[PDB]
C-alpha cells in the first residue's frame, strides 16, 4: 500500500510503466473473462492482449524495474502453446536451508528429461526458489519455455510425474518430508507469474541456477548438461516468458470488482466483519442494516449479497429473495434514513478498542498518500 | 486556472449581477447529485459555489498530473544538455507552483477572477419571461 | 575435470590435440584396452568428419600411454607449446552415472594449471586423485 506509493514517487521507471499502461496498453483492452488475454495484473485485475512488440517492450521494462527492486504482481495464462511451468512447493519438516548443488539439479534435469521423452519430441533449464525462512519451508519453480506442446499431453506428463518416486528419492536425499502432494495437479493449468513478480505478503522468487541441455533427436541417449551462466547480459523477463518465442538466449522449440472500485467498500467490509453475526441472524436488525447500507448508494447491493451468504439456511428460502425485496422497497424509500453512523456505533459497542486501530490505519494511509504526493507541502483542504 | 475552469463547466454555472450589485451564481441541477426535493432539470440560485471549489481541488489535480507525467516523458528521452537543463528548471518551478491549488486564499482569488468569465449579460431579467414554461416536481 | 589443449595450428596436416584427465589413477593394460576400444570407435570418427577431418584414424597412436607426456607449455623441438581450449567439470557416481553434469568450469586461471594437470600430483586443488 504505502510502499507502492513510495516506489511510484521516488522511482522514474514506475512512472514510465504507469504511463505505458495508461497510454500505449489502454488501446489493447481485453474482456475480464475472455481467454484472449495473455497478461493479467491482479492489483487492478487488468487484462491485455499485447502483440509481440508490446510484449517484448513490457518484458524489457519489467526487467529494468525488477533490477531496480520494485514489487510486481503480473501474471500470464498459458495458451495452446507454451513452455513448461512447474509449481514445486517444498514442505519440509524443518525450516533450514537445504544446500542444493548443481550436480543434483542436473540429475533432476536428466530425470525429467527421461520422464518427457515418452512422447513426440524434436534447451535451457531455469531454477528459481523462494527466499526461505517461512512456515513449511520454501518453494521451487523449474521453467522450461523452450518448446510449445500445451495440450492434454501436459496433463499426462503431470500425472506421470505425480507418482514418480525417484524424484521423491532425491527429495529425501535433501531431507524433504513432502515427497507427495508437492507437485500440484494444476501445475501447467494455472496462470503463473513472470519472473520478478512477488506474492501477497511474500517475497518474489529469486533465480538459483541456469543450465543448458541441447536436445539430440539423432542420439537421444546423449544428455550433455553444459552451460555458461552469463545471466546478467540476457533480458531475464523476456527470455523466461512463455509466449516470447523470439527470446535471445532461448529458442522456440463480483464483490472483488466492487472492492477494486471502492476502497471505502473495503473499509465497510472490514467493519462488517467486526460486529458479531448474531444481529444478522434475526430478521429485524439484519433488515435494519440492509436498509442502512441501501441508503448508502445503490451499487452496494452485491456487498449486502456478500453478507447474505452467511447462514445459507436463512439466505436460501428466505434471505436471498427477501433481500432483493427489501432492496426494491428501499429503491423508493424515503421515510427512514439510517446511515453508516449506526454501523460505526455498533462496531464501537460490540468490539471496542479494536476498530480504533483500523480507522487510525485508514486515515493514516489517507494522509500519507497526500504527503507522498506533494512532498510534505501541507496546505488547506488536505 | 480560470480559463481552464471555464472550459470545464461552461454548461453548469452562470454568474449574474442583481439590482443590489452583488454577484450571484446559478447552477443546473443534474440527477444523481445532492439536492433538495424536486428541483431536477432546473437552475438554482447560489451564493458561494461549493461544487466549484470541490472541482477546483479534485478534478483539476488529474490534469495537473497529466502535465507532470508529460514532463516526465519528455525528460526521459535523450537530448542535449541545454534542453535538459531548461526542462529541469521548468519542472522545479512547476512542482513548487502546483501545490498552490489547495490554498484557501488562492482558491478565493481564482473564484473572484473567474466570476468575470462566467458572466452572461441579461440573464436575471429574462428569467420566467416565457409564460408557457412551468417548473414541476419532476421536470 | 576435462581439459582440452591443442597446437597453435597453422601447420601442415592441421594440429595435434591432447585431452588430459589426471583425476584417476589406473595406469595399466586397461589403458591399452581403452586405446584399442577408441581405435575402432566410429562415433568419434563421425564427429571428426563433422569437423572436416580427412584422417578419422591413425590420429590416436596405439602407444599413447606407453610414452612420457609433456607438461602444459612444454613445446616440441622447433615447435610451439600447447594452449588450453576448454575445461569442463563432470562429476561421477558409482551407483548410477547416468546423470552427467559436464557443466563448464569457470575461471581456470585462478589455479596453478601446471600443478593441477600433473599426473603425479595427487594434492592438486582443482583436481582430485580419483
Judged by DSSP in three states, C2 sits in: strand
Beta bridge mates, A209:
A127
- CB half-sphere exposure, A47, CA atoms < 13 A: 11
Q: Cα angle vertex B59, ends B53, B65, to 5°?
A: 130
B103:A379 CB<8 A: yes
CA dist A101 and A111 (Å) reads 15
C-alpha span between A149 and A119 (Å, rounded)? 10
Contacts of B95 in chain A (CB under 8 A): 375
Determine contact, residues A185/A136, Cβ cutoff 8 Å. no
- Nine cell digits for residue A123: 534447451
In terms of C-beta distances under 8 Å and separation of at least 24 residues, what long-range contacts does A335-342 make, across chains too?
A336/A291, A337/A295, A338/A288, A338/A291, A338/A292, A338/A295, A339/A292, A339/A295, A339/A296, A340/A268, A340/A292, A340/A293, A340/A296, A342/A288, A342/A289, A342/A292
Let me know the angle formed at the C-alpha of A244 by A243 and A249, rounded to the nearest 5 degrees: 140
Strand partners, A207: A128
B99 — contact with chain A (CB < 8 Å)?
yes
Nearest-CA distance from A379 to chain B in Å? 6
Q: What is the DSSP string of A13-79?
A: HHHHHHHHHHHTTTTSB--SS-TT--EEETTTTEEE---HHHHHHHHHHHHHHHHHT--B-EEE---
Question: How many C-beta neighbours within 10 Å does residue C47 have?
Answer: 12
Q: Give the CA count within 13 Å in the CB-facing half-sphere of A33.
A: 2
- Assess contact for A225 and A109: CB atoms under 8 A: yes
Taking CA atoms, A193 is separated from A72, A143, A237, A240, in Å, by: 9, 11, 10, 10
Residues ≥6 apart with Cβ < 8 Å to A295:
A330, A337, A338, A339
Neighbours of A144 (CB within 10 A): 21
Q: How far apart are CA B2 and CA B119, in angstroms?
A: 13
CA angle B53–B54–B58, rounded 5-degree value: 120
Number of Cβ pairs < 8 A linking chain A and chain B: 26
Kindly determine whether residue B103 and residue A380, on different chains, have CB atoms separated by under 8 Å. yes
Among the partner-chain residues A105, A111, A225, the one whose CB lies closest to the CB of C102 is A225
Dist CA A115 CA A324 (whole Å) = 55
Q: Distance between CA atoms of A372 and B14, rounded to whole angstroms?
A: 37
C-alpha cell read off for B37: 426535493
Phi, psi of C88 (to 5 degrees): -125, 130
To the nearest 10°, the Cα dihedral for A5, A8, A10, A15?
-160
- Of the candidates A15, A377, A380, the beta carbon closest to that of B104 is on A380
Q: Do A381 and B95 touch (CB under 8 A)?
A: no
C102 vs A contacts (CB less than 8 Å): 224-226
Residue A206 neighbours by CB distance under 10 Å: 11
Contacts 24+ apart (CB under 8 A), C57-62: C60/C35, C62/C32, C62/C35, C62/C36
Rounded-to-integer distance, Cα C67 and Cα A90, Å: 54
Gap between the Cα atoms of C30 and C25, Å rounded: 11
The CA distance from A37 to A50, in Å, is: 8
Please state how this structure was obtained: cryo-EM
CB contact under 8 A, A15 and B57: no
Q: Where are the alpha helices (DSSP H) in C1-130?
A: 29-39, 43-50, 113-117
Please report how many Cα atoms fall inside a 13 Å half-sphere around the Cα of residue A92, on the Cβ side: 19
Measure Cα distances from B132 to A338, B29, B128, B129, B135 in Å: 41, 21, 9, 9, 10
Cα C61 to Cα A137: distance, rounded to the nearest angstrom: 56
Give the span between the Cα atoms of A107 and A225, in whole angstroms.
Answer: 9
Please tell me the distance from the alpha carbon of residue A237 to that of residue A46, in angstroms, as a whole number.
Answer: 19
Instruction: State the Cα–Cα distance between residues A67 and B15, nearest whole angstrom.
Output: 56
Q: How far is CA B54 from the centre of its chain?
A: 9
Mutate to test the interface with B, among A17, A21, A64, A379 (most CBs of B within 10 A): A379
Strands B23-28 and A46-48: unpaired
* Interfacial residues of A (vs C; Cβ cutoff 8 Å): 102-103, 105-107, 109-111, 211, 223-229
Q: What is the dihedral sign for C-alpha A359, A360, A363, A364?
A: negative
B76 to chain A, any CB pair closer than 8 A? The answer is: yes
Name, in order, each residue with C-beta under 8 angstroms of A197's C-beta and a sequence gap of 6 or more: A72, A73, A74, A75, A204
Q: Select the residue of C91, C102, C106 nearest A224 (Cβ to Cβ).
A: C102
Amino acid at each position: 500500500t504505502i510502499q507502492l506509493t513510495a516506489q511510484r514517487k521516488y522511482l522514474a521507471e514506475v512512472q514510465a510503466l504507469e504511463t505505458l499502461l495508461t497510454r500505449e496498453l489502454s488501446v489493447f483492452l481485453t474482456e475480464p473473462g475472455s481467454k484472449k488475454t495473455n497478461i493479467i495484473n491482479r492489483i487492478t485485475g487488468k487484462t491485455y492482449a499485447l502483440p509481440s512488440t508490446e510484449l517484448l517492450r513490457l518484458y524489457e521494462h519489467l526487467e529494468q524495474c525488477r533490477k531496480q527492486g520494485a514489487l510486481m504482481y503480473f501474471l500470464e495464462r498459458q495458451g495452446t502453446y507454451s513452455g513448461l511451468m512447474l509449481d514445486y512447493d517444498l514442505k519440509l519438516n524443518t525450516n533450514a536451508v537445504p544446500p542444493l548443488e548443481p550436480p543434483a539439479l542436473s540429475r533432476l534435469c536428466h530425470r525429467i528429461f527421461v520422464h518427457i521423452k515418452n512422447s513426440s519430441v524434436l534447451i535451457h533449464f531455469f531454477f528459481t526458489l523462494k527466499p526461505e525462512v517461512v512456515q513449511g519451508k520454501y518453494g521451487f519453480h523449474v521453467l522450461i519455455p523452450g518448446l510449445k506442446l500445451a495440450a492434454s499431453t501436459k496433463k499426462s506428463i503431470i500425472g506421470s510425474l505425480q507418482h514418480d518416486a525417484t524424484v521423491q528419492k532425491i527429495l529425501h536425499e535433501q531431507g524433504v518430508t513432502n515427497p507427495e502432494s508437492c507437485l500440484d495437479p494444476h501445475s501447467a493449468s494455472v496462470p503463473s507469474l513472470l519472473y520478478g513478480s512477488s506474492k501477497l505478503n511474500h517475497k518474489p522468487y529469486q533465480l538459483k541456477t541456469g543450465f543448458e541441455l541441447v536436445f539430440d533427436s539423432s542420439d537421444p541417449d546423449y544428455i550433455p548438461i553444459h552451460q555458461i551462466k552469463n545471466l546478467e547480459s540476457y533480458n531475464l523477463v523476456s527470455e523466461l516468458s512463455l509466449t516470447n518465442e523470439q527470446g535471445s538466449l532461448v529458442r522456440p522449440v463480483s464483490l472483488s470488482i466492487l472492492m477494486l472500485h471502492d476502497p471505502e467498500a473495503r473499509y465497510l467490509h472490514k467493519i462488517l466483519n467486526l460486529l458479531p453475526p448474531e444481529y444478522y441472524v434475526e430478521y429485524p436488525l439484519w433488515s435494519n442494516v440492509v436498509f442502512a447500507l441501501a441508503n448508502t448508494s445503490a451499487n452496494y447491493r452485491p456487498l449486502a449479497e456478500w453478507f447474505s451468504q452467511k447462514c445459507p439456511e436463512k439466505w436460501n428460502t428466505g434471505g436471498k429473495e427477501k433481500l432483493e425485496k427489501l432492496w426494491n422497497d428501499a429503491s423508493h424509500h424515503t421515510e427512514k434514513k439510517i446511515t453508516k453512523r449506526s454501523i460505526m456505533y455498533w462496531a464501537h459497542k460490540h468490539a471496542p478498542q479494536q476498530y480504533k486501530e483500523i480507522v487510525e490505519q485508514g486515515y493514516f494511509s489517507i494522509l500519507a498518500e497526500y504527503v507522498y504526493s506533494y512532498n510534505g507541502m501541507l496546505e488547506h483542504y488536505m | 486556472i480560470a480559463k481552464v475552469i471555464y472550459a470545464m463547466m461552461g454548461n453548469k454555472f452562470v454568474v449574474d449581477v442583481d439590482s443590489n450589485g452583488k454577484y450571484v451564481w446559478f447552477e443546473f441541477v443534474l440527477p444523481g447529485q445532492p439536492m433538495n426535493q424536486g428541483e431536477i432539470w432546473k437552475w438554482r440560485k447560489e451564493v458561494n459555489p461549493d461544487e466549484l471549489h470541490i472541482y477546483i481541488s479534485e478534478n483539476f489535480s488529474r490534469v495537473m498530473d497529466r502535465i507532470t507525467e508529460h514532463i516526465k516523458y519528455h525528460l526521459s528521452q535523450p537530448h542535449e544538455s541545454n534542453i535538459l537543463n531548461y526542462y529541469k528548471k521548468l519542472l522545479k518551478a512547476f512542482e513548487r507552483s502546483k501545490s498552490k491549488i489547495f490554498n484557501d486564499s488562492f482558491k478565493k482569488g481564482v473564484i473572484r477572477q473567474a466570476e468575470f468569465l462566467f458572466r452572461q449579460r441579461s440573464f436575471i431579467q429574462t428569467l420566467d419571461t416565457n409564460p408557457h414554461l412551468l417548473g414541476v416536481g419532476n421536470g
